[PDB]
Design a protein around this nucleic acid. Structure first.
Ligand SMILES: [Mg+2]
Ligand SMILES: [Mg+2]
Lengths: 78, 206, 60, 24, 127, 98, 155
RNA sequence: AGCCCUAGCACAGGUGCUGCAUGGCCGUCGUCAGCUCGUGCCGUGAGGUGUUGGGUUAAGUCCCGCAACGAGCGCAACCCCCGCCGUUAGUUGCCAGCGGUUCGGCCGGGCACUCUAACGGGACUGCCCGCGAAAGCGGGAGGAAGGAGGGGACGACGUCUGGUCAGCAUGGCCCUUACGGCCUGGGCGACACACGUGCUACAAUGCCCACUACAAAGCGAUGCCACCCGGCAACGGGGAGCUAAUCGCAAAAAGGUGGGCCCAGUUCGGAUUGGGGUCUGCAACCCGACCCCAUGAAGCCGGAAUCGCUAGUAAUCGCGGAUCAGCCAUGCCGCGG
């Protein structure tokens, strides 16, 4: 399950870090569902692609080490 | 849907390979693909010679390439104006230095792989599908063979129901290992679809 | 898609994981032996001709 | 037997090694 | 001084030298009963002697390798017998009636494709 | 003291082509420790006969490397002559050693 | 067995009492092809007929077996209208097998927790003539005899 | 000139439909003892005879008989492996025999033996009894092997309008700013259910732990990894050897011997779930396998039904390989005990 970094995506932090020099966005869309949710970069509601669309996932502290797609489920009535 | 390939079956006695070159577990893949694109260009751009075997040898950057025909000169020119073009084409893709023999079969109606092509040719020139078989067998049986047999698959005469004409003579002991039976397979790209032609010539023994 | 595919399998790719074998003859994704680049089909074929050196029918 | 990764058999069968089947 | 036979039995080969006198039997550098320990049938391997009455008035030195403990057991049995025909022509006329002299032709028959196991085919359900 | 390897697909023409090296090293060399045959390295392939589902009924192909070994204890240039060039191998490999 | 009448696969004699009939028995005891353990068991069982009775094991074995051989049995028979259990005699090869089969089975049905004891007791209790083997012997003999009426077909 | 870039054009491309337009290749009846032809003869003819009959065989195998006499595709035999002996050959065998041995066939010394691998020999109903017209059948001797010694490869005319246009080839038809292409993500892994094929068990002829060469096919130089150290371990360091009958994967496991559990849903059985980690890979949520701590489910040998196998077979126990970064392999193809 890894232990040398958290294999989280370049294009995502670039956008998170440089969003947090004063930034409060929900319109933030992404296809990088395999990137680990990073220590406390919370607040911002990410929009995750499940294969069909982007899901409004508002993020909290207690859901950190989890990868992004655990919240954007990929199939229906399960 | 039974019956082995009769060369495959006999690569023990009674028949040797179209490639007598040794090697090992990282060259073979490539010493092969080459081996093939060689015959790739040869079989396409030398059809008229009428090339039966295309035997090949190797020993690091040399290659024997003994091309068998019975129209041997149609490969050459009238002195060497083509056979020079070819040792040129070969070594252009084969970044190596290519030998290039040429050969004559003293009797081409014993060359199954020709007998096939001949009959195949005829079929495209809307010929007599059944007397072709009748003739070709008699040709091969004429050149002192011990046994002959020819097969066409189907759409015989453009027919909508695919059929199968066959004809034979003398022995063709397809179950004997010491048989020495040449096997020729030819295509036939007619307007209405592809026929397929097989040729079998018996000779051998002890 | 078998054409745009046979080609793309010759390329070098973003990340080497996306590589793979492919019957160089019969352009084929599955059952391609490493010591040949050859689909079990386009293979049983050559083998029978003798175009494959030293390869015999096994029997015991 | 062959299904307990914590028997020795469990590991022969699985093919693996570890505490319950070490590499000699 | 010396005598020989070569016993074989299904991947198992038996180098056997007898010597006169004692009764002890070294096998791959071990006493018989250390190599064949608990293995209830081994006492048979030296049955060829009890056949001729050389009960235990030979020693024997024996290398035996290849495959199996019980196959070895029978392998030896062939040596112990093929050895004494070559220390007496007439050691024959009462080992044939018991046939300690036949090789024993039998061997792991081959795994065939499509079967599970040589002969055992798989399970037909029909509907 | 010469140690030359001989690998092959064709069993009959190692024992052929490299038993010219048990003559042209006996006639102009001297002592010979004969050909020693090393166990074969058999490479089996197993193919389903048809192009489609018939998972039983297959064919078996094996390509077998026959390995042959030669030692000769008189290293002259009396020998490196027919054993420099005078050929009849055509799909062989050789390792030259000392 | 359409063509020939099949040779009775012969057995190596025992490496102890020297009896075919023993190995026969040993073979039946054998499970997954483990003849070793199989043999240990039968011998270790002969030891519990010293410790228990003054008699010689072999004699007990023989005499118990002889006690579990049936003489009659009902072989089934179809006829177009009903099913008929027809009593015929028992050929000595079948006797041999049923007995030895039955012993082992009777024996593995017993309570004691160990191979060599179950064998032993059974062997004793049946040479006395009160085996659970001997049950499924007098039953067969009885089942014939009760169907003594149909005993006039016997093909 | 080439070659490249945009604007055109002729064209490419399509795993888009048709296996009932096809080729090739496979499966099936079935390794069943059959299916035919030439000429003669019988019949107005379709056809028959031959190929039926009697004996015999695994077999249309042979024999005797006969308006038939022969032949071809089959069967058998020619090829591979396994059994017994010889010939040739020594970086695998060895006190087999003697010397040295830090006691590791390691060091000289030697292929005798074992083996490795190439060629040969051997079995033919040839011998004796008995029956028979014959072929051959029942016995016996010799012999490693008897009467097809055991396993393969090998599939007749043809049948199933069998299978496959998605391996490839191919007639035809349909798409051609899209039924072509390229990418990011998702799906092929969904789950009230129902069959197939398996794996693992339900235990004491058993489980557990310790020790204890019986070895008999294969794979390895962008690799097999000996040996050291770190870690309960997966694995991570360093690092030797071997293009490999030399070095490595490699421990075979059932077995043997000791000990332990005492008939308990258990020291049987290891499903489920919690947690912490290892590895491969750009990346392991959906969707990897591995190690360890915990959790321990159903299962006490299975209704009516139904499958496999006749001997080294079945039952049972491990070993390797192919594809492959890794792997969902309990599958497959193989090896021995
Ligand atoms: Mg009439
Ligand atoms: Mg699927």
């Amino acid at each position: 399950s890894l232990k040398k970094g958290v294999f989280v995506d370049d294009h995502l932090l670039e956008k998170v870090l440089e969003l947090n020099a004063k930034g409060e966005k929900r319109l933030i869309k992404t296809w990088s569902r395999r990137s680990t949710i990073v220590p406390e970069m919370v607040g911002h509601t990410i929009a995750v692609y499940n294969g069909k669309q982007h899901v409004p996932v508002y993020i909290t502290e207690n859901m950190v080490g989890h990868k992004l797609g655990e919240f954007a489920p990929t199939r229906t009535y399960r | 849907g039974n019956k082995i390939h009769p060369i495959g079956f006999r690569l023990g006695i009674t028949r040797d390979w179209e490639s007598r070159w040794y090697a090992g577990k990282k060259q073979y893949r490539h010493l092969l693909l080459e081996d093939q694109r060689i015959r790739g260009l040869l079989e396409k751009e030398l059809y008229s010679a009428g090339l039966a075997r295309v035997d090949i040898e190797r020993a690091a950057d040399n290659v024997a390439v003994t091309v068998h025909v019975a129209k041997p000169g149609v490969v050459i020119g009238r002195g060497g104006e083509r056979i020079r073009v070819l040792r040129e084409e070969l070594a252009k893709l084969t970044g190596k230095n290519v030998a290039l023999n040429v050969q004559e079969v003293q009797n081409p109606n014993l060359s199954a792989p020709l007998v096939a092509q001949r009959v195949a040719e005829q079929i495209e020139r809307r010929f007599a599908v059944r007397r072709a078989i009748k003739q070709a067998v008699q040709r091969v049986m004429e050149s002192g063979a011990k046994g002959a047999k020819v097969i066409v698959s189907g759409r015989i005469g453009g027919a909508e129901q695919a059929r199968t004409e066959w004809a034979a003579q003398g022995r063709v002991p397809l179950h004997t290992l010491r048989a020495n039976i040449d096997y020729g397979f030819a295509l036939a790209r007619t307007t209405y679809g592809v026929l397929g032609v097989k040729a079998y010539i018996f000779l051998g023994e002890v | 898609a078998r054409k745009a595919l046979i080609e793309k399998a010759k390329r070098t790719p973003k990340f080497k994981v996306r590589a793979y074998t492919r019957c160089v003859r019969c352009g084929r994704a599955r059952s391609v032996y490493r010591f040949f680049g050859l689909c079990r089909i386009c293979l049983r074929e050559l083998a029978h001709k003798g175009q494959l050196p030293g390869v015999r029918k096994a029997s015991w | 037997g062959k299904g307990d990764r914590r028997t020795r058999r469990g590991k022969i069968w699985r093919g693996t090694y570890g505490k319950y089947r070490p590499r000699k | 001084e010396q005598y020989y036979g070569t016993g074989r039995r299904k991947e198992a080969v038996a180098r056997v030298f007898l010597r006169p006198g004692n009764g002890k039997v070294t096998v791959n550098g071990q006493d018989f009963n250390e190599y064949f320990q608990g293995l209830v049938r081994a006492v048979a391997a030296l049955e060829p002697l009890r056949a001729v009455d050389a009960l235990g008035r030979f020693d024997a030195y024996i290398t035996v390798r290849g495959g199996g403990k019980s196959g070895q057991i029978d392998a030896i049995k062939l040596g112990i017998a093929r050895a004494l025909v070559q220390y007496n022509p007439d050691y024959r006329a009462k080992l044939k009636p018991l046939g300690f002299l036949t090789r024993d032709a039998r061997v792991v028959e081959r795994k065939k494709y499509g079967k599970h196991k040589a002969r055992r085919a798989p399970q037909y359900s029909k509907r | 003291k010469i140690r030359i390897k001989l690998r092959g697909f064709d069993h009959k023409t190692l024992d052929a082509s490299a038993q010219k090296i048990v003559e042209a090293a006996r006639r102009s060399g001297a002592q010979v420790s004969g050909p020693i045959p090393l166990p074969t390295r058999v490479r089996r392939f197993t193919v389903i006969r048809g192009p489609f589902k018939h998972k039983d009924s297959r064919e078996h192909f094996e390509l077998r490397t026959h390995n042959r070994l030669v030692d000769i204890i008189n290293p002259n240039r009396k020998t490196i002559e027919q054993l420099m060039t005078l050929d009849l191998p055509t799909g062989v490999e050789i390792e030259i050693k000392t | 067995a359409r063509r020939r009448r099949a040779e009775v696969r012969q057995l190596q004699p025992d490496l102890v009492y020297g009896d075919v009939l023993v190995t026969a028995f040993i073979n039946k005891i054998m499970r997954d092809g483990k003849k070793n353990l199989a043999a240990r068991i039968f011998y270790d069982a002969c030891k519990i007929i010293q410790e228990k009775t003054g008699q010689e094991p072999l004699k007990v074995f023989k005499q118990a077996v002889e006690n579990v051989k049936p003489r009659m049995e009902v072989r089934s028979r179809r006829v177009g209208g009903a099913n008929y259990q027809v009593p015929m005699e028992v050929s000595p090869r079948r006797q041999q097998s049923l007995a030895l089969r039955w012993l082992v089975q009777a024996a593995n049905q017993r309570p004691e927790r160990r191979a060599a004891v179950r064998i032993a007791h059974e062997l004793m209790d049946a040479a006395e003539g009160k085996g659970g083997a001997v049950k499924k012997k007098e039953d067969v003999e009885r089942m014939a005899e009760a169907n003594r009426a149909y005993a006039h077909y016997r093909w």
